[PDB]
From a paper:
The spherical [name] ([name], diameter d = 28 nm) is one of the most studied viruses. Its 180 capsid protein (CP) copies are arranged into 20 hexamers and 12 pentamers, resulting in a quasi-icosahedral T = 3 symmetry. The complexation process is driven by protein–protein interactions and by electrostatic interactions between the negatively charged phosphate backbone of the DNA origami and the positively charged amino acid (aa) residues (+9) in the 26-residue arginine-rich N-terminal region of the protein (190 aa, ~20 kDa). Due to the CPs’ innate protein assembly pathways, reassembly results in the formation of hexagonal sheets, empty spheres and tubes.
Author numbering:
A (entry chain F), B (entry chain B), C (entry chain A), D (entry chain D), E (entry chain E), F (entry chain C), ...: 1 to 147
Amino acid sequence: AIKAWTGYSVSKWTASCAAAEAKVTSAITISLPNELSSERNKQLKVGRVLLWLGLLPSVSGTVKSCVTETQTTAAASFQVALAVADNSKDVVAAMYPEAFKGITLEQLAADLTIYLYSSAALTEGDVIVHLEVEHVRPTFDDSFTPV
Amino acid sequence: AIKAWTGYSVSKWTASCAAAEAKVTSAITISLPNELSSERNKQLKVGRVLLWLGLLPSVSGTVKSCVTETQTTAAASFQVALAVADNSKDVVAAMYPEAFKGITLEQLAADLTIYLYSSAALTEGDVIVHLEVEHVRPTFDDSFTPV
Amino acid sequence: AIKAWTGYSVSKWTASCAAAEAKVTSAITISLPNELSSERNKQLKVGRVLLWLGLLPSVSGTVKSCVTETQTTAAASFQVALAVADNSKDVVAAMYPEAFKGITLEQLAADLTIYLYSSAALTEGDVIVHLEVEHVRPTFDDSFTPV
Amino acid sequence: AIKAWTGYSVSKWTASCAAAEAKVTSAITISLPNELSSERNKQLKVGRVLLWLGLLPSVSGTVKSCVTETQTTAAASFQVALAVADNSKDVVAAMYPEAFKGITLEQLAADLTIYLYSSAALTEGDVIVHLEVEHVRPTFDDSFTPV
Amino acid sequence: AIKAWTGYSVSKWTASCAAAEAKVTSAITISLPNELSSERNKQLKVGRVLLWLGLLPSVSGTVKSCVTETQTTAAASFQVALAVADNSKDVVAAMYPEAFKGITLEQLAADLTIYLYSSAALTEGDVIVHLEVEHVRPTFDDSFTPV
Amino acid sequence: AIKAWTGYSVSKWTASCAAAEAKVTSAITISLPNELSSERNKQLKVGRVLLWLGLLPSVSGTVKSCVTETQTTAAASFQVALAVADNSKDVVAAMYPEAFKGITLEQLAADLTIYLYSSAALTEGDVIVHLEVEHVRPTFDDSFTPV
Amino acid sequence: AIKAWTGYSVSKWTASCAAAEAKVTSAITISLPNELSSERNKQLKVGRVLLWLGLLPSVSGTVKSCVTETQTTAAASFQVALAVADNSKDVVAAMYPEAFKGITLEQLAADLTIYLYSSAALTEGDVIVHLEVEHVRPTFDDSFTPV
């Protein structure tokens, strides 16, 4: 498997798709994990992003998803996507990686967002949208307070 | 300033005292900070503990506090304390240190607890009970999943 | 990412195709931006051209596009094209690292044109066509309006 | 004719005023051209500014214009102006240049505004207002993406 | 534009004037700007004074102003003034400069005053009188107190 | 005595606390000195802050003061303060200095405030809180306007 | 892109196939381009041959072509061909190159021929067979005649 750079680090989380009618593009918002939620960590720099997708077997249609800046109408977002994850492939992935170097981890919570499309309708949680983020290593204080 | 050992790391948090009548002991319960709350980190090992105290200047009487195993009547807890933090001293804190080597960080949330006493009444937040914990360095996954 | 040569530069502009019935081929016409439309900058020489295509996900069929000298019957244009961009590929692009070397930027406005084909119908905004063009860095007036 | 400093550059743009009744002052608003309205170039620093005026000969009386920070009542603006252009002169110009050194080109788009006054009525297009601006040489995109 | 001497410095401020009937001479009282109002700065010495004038364009008469020692009845002061600024001239200005070398900035607040005349009536804010003063540079404490 | 950095400068001012009953904490608001009140200077940046104290000799209690971000109930601020000035010490001063590097002088007027405590009652002017601030040098224009 | 050897040179031309019913194999005759038709040039020697293909996009079948010695019944030639160009592949080209080293350009006009096959019917100009040839450089006389 792929390795992060020296001085970089990995974390992973999850979100579930909202129910939606066919051909509609839905939107999903990135919320940070608790391990990074403090004001010390939000100012770290992103190094790579790796969207991923997995699905329960009764979903029959095409399914596509991507990471972009937030686009003012949801469906249009794919038109600037530097790659698209796609259940028509053998492997349903979209490793960028170069898209977001030097962006603050705050900004990856602020306005980068995840979009999802299916040619058939979805019920809640029919799709699970993993995400993986590789970023500058978090640090904890090396010493107690003074007395 | 005091350094943590190699492979160990600092962290800090807070709790505030409830209102209490004079010469009554009160309990305070440790709850872990968000940075440590995950199932990966709760199983780490404690290395040192450092109770500390700070107080707003109108508080007149004695104030004493300690960290112990939970004692079935609150006032009795001091009678097993390996040291006591005490506003009679010049420096109020009470470094133990090695009362708790090899205890699980979960257990430091489970049943080690903080007790506080004053010979005069307190109103809410009149005392701020800092804490520091020095513990094995948290680790994050070095690599992405397989595709 | 791919760099231009020393002293060369890049610019980008956009077009959205009109509606078309299935299997029709449609033309798209270049127009120069204002900074390049000066009589000082129009005389620059093209170094590379890069066609790039993106589409909203509901376009189900094949989509193909290419750059050619303007053909009197539009559908034939692909037959002369030195390369074709095609949504059957993994990356929907076509690079021409040779075809237009040394052509004047005016001529790239005059008689090179972009062609687009789809095996299913299209409606306005269903496809976005980029172009990227590389040339020696343009220049700006060094002085105000004189005497 | 006057030249920009070493490493500085020039740009020019135009506006044509709306109709106005006699002695009423009116406002003219800057908008940046696209090549400057990049997030790379918007943050460049202004070096000199020149207001220049021209008119068709049937405009009978005095015409005056000036550049100021925006004013709450438009007619007052001349009173703050570091210089005024005035068709009573032989040459209808007003080079500042000191007024705006070090202001951001975005700010020159934001809140510097141009005012115009005539001692007789005006109809659309009876007056043309130039502006010239000097700033450090703008730059263009030049590079490849990664994989 | 003209620079101040080494160790001298420029400051600038505004005064309006009240309504007046035609041919009436009026007085404007100098008050120091806030940047200089403290008892440290008042004892600095003046090097040059520049009177300057502007007006909103509907003012039709002549307008004249000057700086003088304060006079028992305002109109007479023009006969004493070393120079007059005058809207009939090419430049509506009067650099003195010799009048006030070595006068204390407090004295420039005390008994030098500004006089203003117009051949037609005026209303509040029709004429705005700038003043510009060149004077020994202000200074501040280079050192903290003793502890 | 300690000196400000190159390009930085010292200024000093005053505030007098109101009357208060014993053990009451009180607040003091940082109004700027007139020498810095103009819009040109408010956007300078702070380098160090130096709280100081003095009192007329009949004040019998302890007295303590500190500089903090403004707090919901005044007494709490001593628990947040990075250092405390104190009449009981050998010298009462409490040079921070790290607390406010790079903060805007406007912000030092906005939401940093002074807190004061005494273990005995006070009357108007019994305690006088000096303050001293080290900050980027104030500057004045080098030249007159155009004529 | 691939280059010809020193002393060798590139030239390129065209032929358009006639209409044919499905599964019919057809032949195409290699007429020389005018630039090489003179008796001086026909005795040059071939270095490489590069068959190429393109088609207008509505052609629905498979299409295959190859270069061989002329064969008694056209379909058989695919069984003799050293390589086959093919629309079903990732890229349709079929660079030989070994097939014809040292053959005379006259012979490449005489008895080498192009064969073309489609699994569906064709109409005139649906398929366009480019060809590219790399061969000993054409030369022109260095001097006038004697007078």
